[PDB]
Short mmCIF file of C-alpha atoms in Angstrom, two decimals:
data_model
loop_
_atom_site.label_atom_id
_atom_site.label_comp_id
_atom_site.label_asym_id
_atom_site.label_seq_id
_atom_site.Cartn_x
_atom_site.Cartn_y
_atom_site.Cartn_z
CA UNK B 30 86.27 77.21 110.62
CA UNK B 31 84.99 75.25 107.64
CA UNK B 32 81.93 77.38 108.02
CA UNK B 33 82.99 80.45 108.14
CA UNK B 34 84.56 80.26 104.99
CA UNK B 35 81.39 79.01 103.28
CA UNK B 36 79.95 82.30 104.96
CA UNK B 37 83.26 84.09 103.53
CA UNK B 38 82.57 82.59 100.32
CA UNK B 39 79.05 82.64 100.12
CA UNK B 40 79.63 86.56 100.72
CA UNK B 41 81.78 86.92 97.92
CA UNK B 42 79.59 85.43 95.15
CA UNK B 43 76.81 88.05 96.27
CA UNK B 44 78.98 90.59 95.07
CA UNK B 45 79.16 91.60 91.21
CA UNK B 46 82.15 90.75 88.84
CA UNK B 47 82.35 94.30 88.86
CA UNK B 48 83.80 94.86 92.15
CA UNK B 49 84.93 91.50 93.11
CA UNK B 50 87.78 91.79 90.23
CA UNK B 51 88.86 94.93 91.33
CA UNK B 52 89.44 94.03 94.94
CA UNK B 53 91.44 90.62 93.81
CA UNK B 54 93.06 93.08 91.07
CA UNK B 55 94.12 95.22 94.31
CA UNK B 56 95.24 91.87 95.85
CA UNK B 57 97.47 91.67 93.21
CA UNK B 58 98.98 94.59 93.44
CA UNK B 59 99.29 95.11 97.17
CA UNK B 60 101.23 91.24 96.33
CA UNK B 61 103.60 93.21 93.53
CA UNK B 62 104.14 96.31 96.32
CA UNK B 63 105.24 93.24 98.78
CA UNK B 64 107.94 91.41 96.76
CA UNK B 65 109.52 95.15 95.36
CA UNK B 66 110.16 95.67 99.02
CA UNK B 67 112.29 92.24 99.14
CA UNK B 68 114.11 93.02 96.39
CA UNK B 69 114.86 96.18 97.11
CA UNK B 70 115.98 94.72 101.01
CA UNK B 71 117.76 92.50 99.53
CA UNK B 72 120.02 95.09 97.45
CA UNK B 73 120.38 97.35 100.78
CA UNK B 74 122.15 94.59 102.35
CA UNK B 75 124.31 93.59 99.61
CA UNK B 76 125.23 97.00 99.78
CA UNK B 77 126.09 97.09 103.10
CA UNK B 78 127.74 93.75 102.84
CA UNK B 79 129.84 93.87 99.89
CA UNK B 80 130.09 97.39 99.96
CA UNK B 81 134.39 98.40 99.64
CA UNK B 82 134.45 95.23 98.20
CA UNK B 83 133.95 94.38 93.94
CA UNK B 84 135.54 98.41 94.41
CA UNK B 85 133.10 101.32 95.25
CA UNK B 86 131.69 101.79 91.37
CA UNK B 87 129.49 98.88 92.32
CA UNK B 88 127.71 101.76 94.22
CA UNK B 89 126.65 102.59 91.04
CA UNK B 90 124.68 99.57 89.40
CA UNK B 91 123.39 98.86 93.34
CA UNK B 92 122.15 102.58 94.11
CA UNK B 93 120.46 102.71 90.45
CA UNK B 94 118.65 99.31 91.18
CA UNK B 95 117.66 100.30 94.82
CA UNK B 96 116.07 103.17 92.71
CA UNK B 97 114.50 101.34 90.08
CA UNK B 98 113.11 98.68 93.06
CA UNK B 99 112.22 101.66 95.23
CA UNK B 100 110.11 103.61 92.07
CA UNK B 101 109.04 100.41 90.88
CA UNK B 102 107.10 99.48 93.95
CA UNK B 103 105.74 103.21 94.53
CA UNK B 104 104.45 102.94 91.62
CA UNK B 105 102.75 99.27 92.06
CA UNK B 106 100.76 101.49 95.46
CA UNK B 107 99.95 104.56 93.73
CA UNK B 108 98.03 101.97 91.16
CA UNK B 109 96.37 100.26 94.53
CA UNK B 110 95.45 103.75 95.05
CA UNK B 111 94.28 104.23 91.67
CA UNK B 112 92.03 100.54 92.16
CA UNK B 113 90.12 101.71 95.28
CA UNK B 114 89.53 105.12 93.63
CA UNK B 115 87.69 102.57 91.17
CA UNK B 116 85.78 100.44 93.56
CA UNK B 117 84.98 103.46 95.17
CA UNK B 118 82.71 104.95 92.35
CA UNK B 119 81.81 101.72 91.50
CA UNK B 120 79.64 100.99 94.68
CA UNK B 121 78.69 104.95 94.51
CA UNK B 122 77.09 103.50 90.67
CA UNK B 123 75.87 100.50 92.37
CA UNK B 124 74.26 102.24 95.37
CA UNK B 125 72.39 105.01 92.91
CA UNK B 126 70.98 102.64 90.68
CA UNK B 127 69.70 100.75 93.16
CA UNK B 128 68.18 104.01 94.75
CA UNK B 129 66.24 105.19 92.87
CA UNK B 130 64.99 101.68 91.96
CA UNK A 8 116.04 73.80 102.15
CA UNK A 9 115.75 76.40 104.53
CA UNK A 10 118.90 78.02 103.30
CA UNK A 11 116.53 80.44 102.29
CA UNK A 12 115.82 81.08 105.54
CA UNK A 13 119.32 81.38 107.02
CA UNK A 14 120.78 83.83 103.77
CA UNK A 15 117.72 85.77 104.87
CA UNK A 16 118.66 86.01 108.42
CA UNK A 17 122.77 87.08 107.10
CA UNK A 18 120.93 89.28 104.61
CA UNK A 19 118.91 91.30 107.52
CA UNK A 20 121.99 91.31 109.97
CA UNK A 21 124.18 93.57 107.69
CA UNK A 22 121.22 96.30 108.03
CA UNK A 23 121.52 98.98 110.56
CA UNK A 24 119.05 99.63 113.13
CA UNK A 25 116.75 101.96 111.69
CA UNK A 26 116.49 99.81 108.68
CA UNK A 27 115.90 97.15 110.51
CA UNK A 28 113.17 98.84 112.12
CA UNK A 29 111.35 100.52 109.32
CA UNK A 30 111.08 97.10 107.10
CA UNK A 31 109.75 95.30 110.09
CA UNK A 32 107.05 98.11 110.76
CA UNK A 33 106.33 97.68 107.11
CA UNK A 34 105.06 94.19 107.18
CA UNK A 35 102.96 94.72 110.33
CA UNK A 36 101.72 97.52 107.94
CA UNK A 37 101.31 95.49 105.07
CA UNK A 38 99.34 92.86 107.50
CA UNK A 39 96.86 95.56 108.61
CA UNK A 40 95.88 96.60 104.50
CA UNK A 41 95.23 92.97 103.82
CA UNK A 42 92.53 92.89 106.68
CA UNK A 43 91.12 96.54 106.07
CA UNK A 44 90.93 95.35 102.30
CA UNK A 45 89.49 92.23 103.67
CA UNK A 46 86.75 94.26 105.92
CA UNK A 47 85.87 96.19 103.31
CA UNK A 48 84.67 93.47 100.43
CA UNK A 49 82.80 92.09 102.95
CA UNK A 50 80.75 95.34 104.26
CA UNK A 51 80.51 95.89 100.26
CA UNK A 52 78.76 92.56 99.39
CA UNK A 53 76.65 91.95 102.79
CA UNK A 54 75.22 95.84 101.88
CA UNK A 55 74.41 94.45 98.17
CA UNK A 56 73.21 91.11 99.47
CA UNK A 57 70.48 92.81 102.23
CA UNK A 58 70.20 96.19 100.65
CA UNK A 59 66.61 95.80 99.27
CA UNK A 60 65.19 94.07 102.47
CA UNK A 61 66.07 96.91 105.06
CA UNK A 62 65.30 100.20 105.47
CA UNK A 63 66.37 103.85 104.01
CA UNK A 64 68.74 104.23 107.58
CA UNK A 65 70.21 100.95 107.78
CA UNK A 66 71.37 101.55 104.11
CA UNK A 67 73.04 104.82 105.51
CA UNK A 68 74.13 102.53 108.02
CA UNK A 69 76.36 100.39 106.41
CA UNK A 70 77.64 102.58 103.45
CA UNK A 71 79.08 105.29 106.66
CA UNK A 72 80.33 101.79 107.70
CA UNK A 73 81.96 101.42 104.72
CA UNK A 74 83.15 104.51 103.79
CA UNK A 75 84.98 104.13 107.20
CA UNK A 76 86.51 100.67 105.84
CA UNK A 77 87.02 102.69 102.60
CA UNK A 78 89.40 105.32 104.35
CA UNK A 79 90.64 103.28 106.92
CA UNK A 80 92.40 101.30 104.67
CA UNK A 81 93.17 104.39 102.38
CA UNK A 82 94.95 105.61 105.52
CA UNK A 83 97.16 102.38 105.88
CA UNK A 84 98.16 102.28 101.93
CA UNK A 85 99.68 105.80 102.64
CA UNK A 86 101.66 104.82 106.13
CA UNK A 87 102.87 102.03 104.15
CA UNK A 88 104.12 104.81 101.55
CA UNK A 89 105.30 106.91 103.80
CA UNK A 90 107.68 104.14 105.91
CA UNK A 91 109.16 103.16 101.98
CA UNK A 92 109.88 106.74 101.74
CA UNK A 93 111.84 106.85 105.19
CA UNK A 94 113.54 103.55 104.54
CA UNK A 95 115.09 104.93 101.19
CA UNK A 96 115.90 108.25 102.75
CA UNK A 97 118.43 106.12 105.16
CA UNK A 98 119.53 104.22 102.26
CA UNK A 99 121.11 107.40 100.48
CA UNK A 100 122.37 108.75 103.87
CA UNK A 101 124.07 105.69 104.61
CA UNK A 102 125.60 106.14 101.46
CA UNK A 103 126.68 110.36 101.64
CA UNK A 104 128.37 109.07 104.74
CA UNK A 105 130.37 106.67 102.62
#
């Protein structure tokens, strides 16, 4: 309980700037990736609810935001994927210089 | 208060099925990255914390260990993907039928 998250943090602070910023920075994102996804839920059932109703052009300004949401979070994972690409070759640095050290 | 709660639950019920489905498999998804993520800082930092102190194989120990974490929860990023993908391909075919 309260100790394991002295262990947790005591783990954390053993860790350079370096990587710990990159994994909260991936946090971050993985948060941004969440809350498109609402969004874009949310304007999928507005579509189906409203749907014949405020006419059938309101296809239009719906489908392009379900779009926009839809790119907008692909885009928010593809950086995630990006960030661990980082950290990656940032403990591969880490590890060699402690090698040969 | 919680009105939040009950627009959510009108909000969900005008979704068919698969939707449904594939948004719900998302989270569990999106549950699973948080703890791979998770696994992974720690294997990082506990490998920087005792790397010095053990020896040459337990080093090659815990970075395989962590290159596991590392793709594991590469792996999980790209299911996630991949169900967005199939959620927005029922989207626009809900729509051609329309």
């Amino acid at each position: 309980a309260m100790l394991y998250l002295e262990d947790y943090l005591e783990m954390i602070e053993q860790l350079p700037m370096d990587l710990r910023d990159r994994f909260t920075e991936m946090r971050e994102m993985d948060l941004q990736v969440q809350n498109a996804m609402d969004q874009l839920e949310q304007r999928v059932s507005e579509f189906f609810m409203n749907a014949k109703k405020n006419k059938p052009e309101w296809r239009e300004e719906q489908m392009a935001s379900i779009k926009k949401d839809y790119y907008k979070a692909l885009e928010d994972a593809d950086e995630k994927v990006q960030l661990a690409n980082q950290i990656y070759d940032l403990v591969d640095r880490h590890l060699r210089k402690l090698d040969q050290e």
